[PDB]
């Protein structure tokens, strides 16, 4: 226990959560993002709002949180409050009336390599273009758009953990069957700024 206390003290003595966790500011923070769908809570056809319970797994390397395991008795991983570290500010762009960003700040898992894994729970009320023509035999292609709100792709780069959302924990809905799911990474360039 004393080893882990010493480690946590040594790491955060002069840590800063404002700067990006890179050796040089010209580097890009590589964040790996993976959506896990736990439950399809509701589909609101009149308001076009879909309520879902998800885990938004995020992984990145913090260059400053490395340590040598033999200095601390072989401690290879520790859990620390996510409020202390730098975090990607992923926002649900197409939020209807829910929380835009993560608000349940669970603890992250920090490994001696500086690899951080964060899997905060969130309830996403994504806006969906409900098509009602074939009601009640309709198929709804509802989507969730996740991106860093303020960081751009030349500063922080997000990559999908897998081509499809993780449904291994999905609770079966009594009203809807998920026929297909897929994740796509989109990059867009604007006439202001080629780079």
């Amino acid at each position: 226990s004393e080893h882990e206390t010493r480690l946590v003290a040594k790491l955060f003595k002069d840590y800063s959560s404002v700067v990006r966790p890179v050796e040089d500011h010209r580097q890009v923070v590589e964040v790996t993002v993976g959506l896990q769908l736990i439950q399809l809570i509701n589909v609101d056809e009149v308001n076009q709002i879909v309520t879902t319970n998800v885990r938004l797994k995020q992984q990145w390397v913090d260059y400053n949180l490395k340590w040598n395991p033999d200095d601390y008795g072989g401690v290879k991983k520790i859990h620390i409050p996510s409020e202390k570290i730098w975090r990607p500010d992923l926002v649900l762009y197409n939020n209807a009336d829910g929380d835009f960003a993560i608000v349940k700040f669970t603890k992250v898992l920090l490994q001696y390599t500086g690899h951080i894994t964060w899997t905060p729970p969130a309830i996403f009320k994504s806006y969906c273009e409900i098509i009602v023509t074939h009601f009640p035999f309709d198929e709804q292609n509802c989507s969730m758009k996740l991106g860093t709100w303020t960081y751009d792709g030349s500063v922080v780069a997000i990559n999908p953990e897998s081509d499809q959302p993780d449904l291994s924990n999905f609770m079966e809905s009594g009203e809807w069957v998920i026929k297909e799911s897929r994740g796509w990474k989109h990059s867009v360039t604007y006439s202001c700024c080629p780079d």
Partner: antibody, heavy 120, light 107 residues
Framework: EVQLQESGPGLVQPSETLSLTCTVS????????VSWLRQPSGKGPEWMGR???????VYNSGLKSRLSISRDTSKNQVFLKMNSLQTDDTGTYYC??????????????WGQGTLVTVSS | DIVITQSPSLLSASVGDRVTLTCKGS??????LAWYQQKLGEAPKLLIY???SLQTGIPSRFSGSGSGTDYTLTISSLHSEDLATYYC????????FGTGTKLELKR
């Protein structure tokens, strides 16, 4: 300015406790960690343990049971005790001052080193 | 722990020659490799750390380079004072030291 002097019994019989002292000059033990290195004859050095600035200690996992380290901040000395010596423990012993960057540590200054020989 | 090997074991060189020393790990050392100089009966002296950074008061003759698994120490102009044994060591995953290379005068 910064100097470390290693001293102690150069000839030690097997099965009796080795003791070594490191004398520090030019810096305070409350601001710099001190670590002990061992170099068996005919081999590259190895790391044995560290006296932390906060007053705690850490040891090589193979030597964890054998080694004991302590310090006296009032006289700038670091002490090492080691029992159950064998002929394989013959070598040169260095105390070092350690730099830090965040949680990472490395050795920046060495003592002159004391030779310890174990023979019947 | 990461195993480290050095080559050559002995290097014969003459004053003023460009001389370079190779240190090679068994795993990614991530630029956390350091070089120190040792002389017979003298206290070893740190030359380079983080693969690139001179220790204060070391002559600018010494410069290090490398990334990933392979690292080098280079002396721009060998002086007679530089004949010594050079050890590389890494400090991200345990502490492991190379076998050392002995730098000796060509004759």
């Amino acid at each position: 300015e910064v100097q470390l002097q290693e001293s102690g019994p150069g000839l030690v019989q097997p099965s009796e406790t080795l003791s070594l002292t490191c004398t520090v000059s030019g810096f305070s033990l409350t601001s710099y960690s001190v670590s002990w290195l061992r170099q068996p004859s005919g081999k590259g050095p190895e790391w044995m343990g560290r006296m932390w600035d906060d007053g705690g200690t850490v040891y090589n996992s193979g030597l964890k049971s054998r080694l004991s380290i302590s310090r006296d901040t009032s006289k700038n000395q670091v002490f090492l005790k080691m029992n159950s010596l064998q002929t394989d423990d013959t070598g040169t012993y260095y105390c070092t001052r350690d730099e830090r960057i965040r949680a990472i540590n490395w050795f920046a200054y060495w003592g002159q080193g004391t030779l310890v020989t174990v023979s019947s | 722990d990461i195993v480290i090997t050095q080559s050559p074991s002995l290097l014969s060189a003459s004053v003023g020659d460009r001389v370079t020393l190779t240190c090679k790990g068994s795993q990614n050392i991530d630029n956390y490799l350091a070089w120190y100089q040792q002389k017979l009966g003298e206290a070893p002296k740190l030359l380079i750390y983080k693969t690139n950074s001179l220790q204060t008061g070391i002559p600018s003759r010494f410069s290090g380079s490398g990334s990933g698994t392979d690292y080098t120490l280079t002396i721009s102009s060998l002086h007679s004072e530089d004949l010594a044994t050079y050890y590389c060591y890494q400090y991200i995953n345990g502490y492991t030291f190379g076998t050392g290379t002995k730098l000796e005068l060509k004759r």
